[PDB]
């Protein structure tokens, strides 16, 4: 059952928060430039 | 005053050569010497208050 | 993490069993026609290599779970463990000293007037055995990471033990495999005594030939008069029937039982003589059985120690089980190869006074032994190297040393086999140290 | 099923920095699903058989 499954099933995004953390340079995402596991939490933290 | 640190990502491959790595804490001190030194003089003449 | 995996991965289907059943007009596949769910036993019959996700049948949102965790243990053993001859903690080397018989002299009294105090040294041979294997095994158990793999503490603790059972099942296997490695070592060194057979799988005639040569060989190894013919040091020695062991594979035992020991009325007259030890096989090409003493394996233990350490940054343990052990072969044992392939005529030339120490200017008699499997002539060609100043050996093994010899000699006895366009040599080497002298002038006439 | 592993040659020199390294256990596995769901049907009149 259910071969071709992505975690982004049924989601339209306003922006990418993965790219918003790596490209921060103090542009309000400077608080997430720490948090070594920010990508892993941002990937599956919506359920 | 000890102060907070940063976290490190759990990785068994980077932990293999870094069991004994040092990380000095964040301590800030402050010093407070005695400043005020004074006395309050009042003369009470009894036998005249009586 | 494994998006597109089907149940058919290394499956090499000779046929479809489902198309065999539903298109069965009539065959043996007709008995699987009234099975209600034959097509579901056909799919997940062999298990699945990669667990996919199964949704529940009633409510398709629920994930059907794993209900059972079977953790297979295995207890491997070493069948060759009985050949291990003890353990030593201190020291490294072992010294086998062996005394050999001598050659009688003819009685003469007139020669005996001067040669009374003249001495004859014993034919003592010496073999040395070092520590060879020095190893350790490494297994990591990331405790906190594997708590995602399990939901039961009784199962989790049983899996961690299965890793520790897998370390001891590793040191058992290598100790089996190093002790086979000696046998395939010693065969390729040309040190076994080859008795050429035909392959016993090929014929019940070729099988019956084998047991006759076997029982002839084991009887020859145990004669009271001893034999030089069955060692690699070529010494007069004997073996016992309680000492002999036979290391056939599991093929020969099955053709021994069904074809030979079955129809025989007296099993004591066709059974393999001595103790029979069954292994999986030898890695040589042509080598089928090996008949040794228990003295042929000098397998001692120097160290067995498991030591642990815990990493705090990465949250794991490490299991260092250390095996240091002597894995050597005594060349004083009778030890017989049973080779079914084509073999060379000469396998080893033995120049039995291997260590010699001749005084400068002094003589020495050398004696070459030839292992001829063709049973032919093979004349020894003598040679001396390394001391190329004035003197060398005769053609019959008499070492002559010049008075200015100051280099450690090497005495070669060589049997030229092979063809004329490309000769191949079988060489026996012995070393000679030259302890110098005095009381001589640099010139004479 | 937990499988067996390899030998490393003893070396006290390389054991100075290669403490705490990792060697993975050889482990294989299998998963067996519920295949058969069967269903048997018999009826008894119990009165027309009288």
């Amino acid at each position: 059952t259910f071969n071709d499954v992505k975690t982004s099933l049924g989601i339209t995004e306003s922006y990418d928060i993965v790219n918003a953390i790596r490209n921060s340079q103090g542009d309000n995402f400077k608080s997430y430039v720490p948090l070594a596991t920010a990508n892993n939490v941002a990937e599956v933290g919506a359920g | 005053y000890t102060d907070i640190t940063k976290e490190k990502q759990y990785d068994a491959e980077e932990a293999e050569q870094k069991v004994f790595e040092r990380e000095m804490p964040n301590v800030k001190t402050l010093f407070h010497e005695r400043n005020r030194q004074g006395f309050y003089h009042q003369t009470i003449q009894d036998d005249s208050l009586k | 993490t494994f998006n597109d995996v089907k149940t058919s991965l290394g499956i090499t289907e000779s046929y479809d069993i489902v198309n065999a059943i539903r298109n069965s007009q009539g065959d043996n596949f007709k008995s699987y026609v009234p099975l209600a769910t034959a097509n579901n036993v056909a799919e997940v019959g062999a298990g699945i290599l990669i667990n996919q996700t199964v949704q529940n049948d009633f409510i398709t949102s629920l994930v059907d779970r794993i209900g059972l965790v079977v953790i297979r243990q295995v207890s491997l053993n070493n069948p060759l463990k009985k050949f291990k001859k003890g353990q030593i903690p201190l020291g490294r080397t072992i010294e086998e000293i062996y005394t050999d018989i001598t050659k009688e002299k003819q009685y003469d009294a007139e020669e005996a007037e001067q040669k009374v105090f003249e001495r004859e040294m014993p034919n003592v041979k010496t073999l040395f055995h070092e520590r060879n294997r020095q190893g350790f095994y490494h297994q990591t158990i990331q405790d906190d990471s594997l708590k995602t793999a399990f939901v039961s503490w009784g199962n989790f603790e049983s899996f961690v033990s299965s890793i520790i059972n897998a370390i001891y099942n590793s040191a058992e296997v290598d100790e089996y495999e190093y002790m086979k490695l000696l046998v395939d070592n010693y065969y390729s060194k040309g040190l076994f005594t080859t008795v050429k057979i035909d392959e016993p799988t090929s014929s019940t005639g070729a099988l019956t030939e084998f047991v006759k040569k076997m029982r002839a060989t084991a009887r020859k190894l145990t004669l009271p008069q001893g034999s030089r013919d069955w060692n690699s040091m070529a010494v007069r020695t004997r073996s016992y029937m309680e000492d002999l062991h036979l290391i056939i594979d599991a093929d020969l035992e099955a053709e021994l039982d069904v074809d030979v020991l079955a129809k025989a009325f007296n099993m004591n007259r066709t059974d393999f003589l001595g103790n029979v030890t069954v292994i999986d096989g030898f890695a040589s090409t042509g080598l089928e059985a090996v008949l040794v003493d228990k003295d042929w394996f000098m397998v001692y233990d120097n160290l067995h120690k498991m030591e642990t350490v815990r990493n705090p940054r990465g949250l794991y343990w490490n299991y260092y089980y250390h095996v240091w052990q002597t894995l050597s072969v005594s060349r004083f044992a009778n030890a017989v190869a049973f080779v079914s392939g084509d073999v060379p005529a000469v396998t080893q030339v033995i120049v039995s006074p291997n260590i010699a120490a001749v005084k400068q200017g002094g003589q020495q008699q050398f004696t070459a032994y030839v292992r001829a499997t063709n049973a032919k002539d093979h004349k020894v060609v003598w040679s001396v190297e390394g001391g190329s100043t004035g003197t060398a050996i005769t053609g019959d093994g008499l070492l002559s040393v010049s008075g200015n010899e100051d280099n450690q000699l090497t005495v070669k006895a060589t049997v030229d086999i092979g063809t004329e366009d490309k000769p191949k040599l079988v060489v026996g080497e012995a070393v000679v140290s030259i302890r110098p002298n005095n009381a001589s002038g640099g010139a004479q006439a | 099923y937990t499988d067996i592993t390899k030998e490393k040659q003893y070396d006290a020199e390389e054991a100075e920095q290669k403490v705490f390294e990792r060697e993975m256990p050889n482990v294989k596995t299998l998963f067996h699903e519920r295949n058969r769901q069967g269903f048997y049907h018999q009826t008894i009149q119990d009165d027309s058989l009288k």
Partner: protein, 55 residues
């Protein structure tokens, strides 16, 4: 060592790269034909995407 680069226009892996400068951060693009390149892409990098140059 390494430093931050801002890419410039659709960098492809294994291609030869060259540096420039603009607003601030060094810009990276594919090296022009018939010259000496500065860096090799190890992965694809989007037009305005910040990344590292592993020196």
């Amino acid at each position: 060592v390494s430093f931050t680069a801002r890419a410039k226009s659709n960098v492809m892996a294994y291609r030869l790269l060259a540096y420039s400068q603009g607003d601030d951060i060094i810009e990276i693009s594919h090296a022009a034909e018939n010259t000496i390149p500065d860096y090799v892409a190890v992965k694809d990098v989007d037009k305005g995407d910040l990344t590292q140059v592993n020196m």
